């Protein structure tokens, strides 16, 4: 149990280190200015509650996926899936970056 | 074939070798945590039975997503929210491991 | 477009040659037998027709998720949990193996 | 911030230089193309006007997920389930792709 805690630290530090990697960073920032886009775009255009807007564009943009709701226009359709590509490729830049980071 | 199943053996030993991982076992933990913790938060918040409470909390976290059941309440629309990134940042961690056990 | 046609012969062989490796032959015969059980399960347990069964386990198994159907029965629902790990369990599975075979 | 715009258009530069690498634009081409073929038979074998034929490819072999739409013909099922792996297919390519790119 002390071990337990003591590696729990290790791993947290190591990952509060990694919020201080500049590219990290600007994945982070790029990450949030989409999930704002997004959740300006459907309040908009899908007349969603801000809440539900921003909500759906995070199980989109994570790959979760919505069972409840689905974009009626065909503007909507579109940008989502544009806005699935983009966290695509935002996953892979964390990833990559994982990557790097482990191989140095 | 004795060559596949010595050959599933050493993969499955493999696999126990890592519940033996210090870092993997915290990380483990930190999931049932979560996941226990969500059970608690969408059977009290949202009213689901603790069975529903957990499935809804397990397709969630691990990014399946569900076609079912969809928060009613602000809280639990943004409780799921930071749940998601929770989960996010726990497939992370174990993706980093089996990285690092890569050297 | 002749390099294109032949990275793409370099990359299909590569990943024929995939085929060949005997612990990714075990992952993928327990994939296929983790699929039979799911069909087998949610077609008897759930009622599901076979075909649907199958579907429910491939887009479960794969994290891609449903958004039509869900387990009824707090069997089924116990199951499908157990069911999500397994496939997660697999995907490592196939996700350390790419990592080694590119890191030796 | 100088310092973060520099980091991100060096950022978009390693980015750009990936879609320069020919065994990266085989994927794309391949999924561009896999998704124009799923567009055209949920058009045509389950009726979907285009847009929403090419929504569901979308959702699908990125492994998002649909809470709406879902084949009602035993062909679109069997389709789907292959459509899915491919998709898992050219994830792991593309993911094998971005390992390579670490030595
Ligand atoms: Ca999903
Ligand atoms: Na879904
Ligand atoms: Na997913």
Chains 1, 3 share one sequence.
């Not at 979760?64 to 490729?89: A, E, H, M, R, W």
């Amino acid at each position: 149990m002390l071990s337990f805690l003591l590696t729990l630290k290790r791993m947290l530090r190591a990952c509060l280190r990694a919020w201080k990697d500049k590219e990290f960073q600007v994945l982070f920032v790029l990450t949030i200015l989409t999930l704002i886009s997004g959740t300006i775009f459907y309040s908009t255009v899908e007349g969603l509650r801000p809440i539900d807007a921003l909500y759906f564009s995070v199980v989109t943009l994570t790959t979760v996926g919505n069972g409840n709701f689905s974009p009626q226009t065909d503007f909507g359709k579109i940008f989502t899936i544009l806005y699935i590509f983009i966290g695509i490729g935002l996953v892979f830049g964390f990833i990559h970056k994982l990557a790097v980071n482990v191989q140095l």
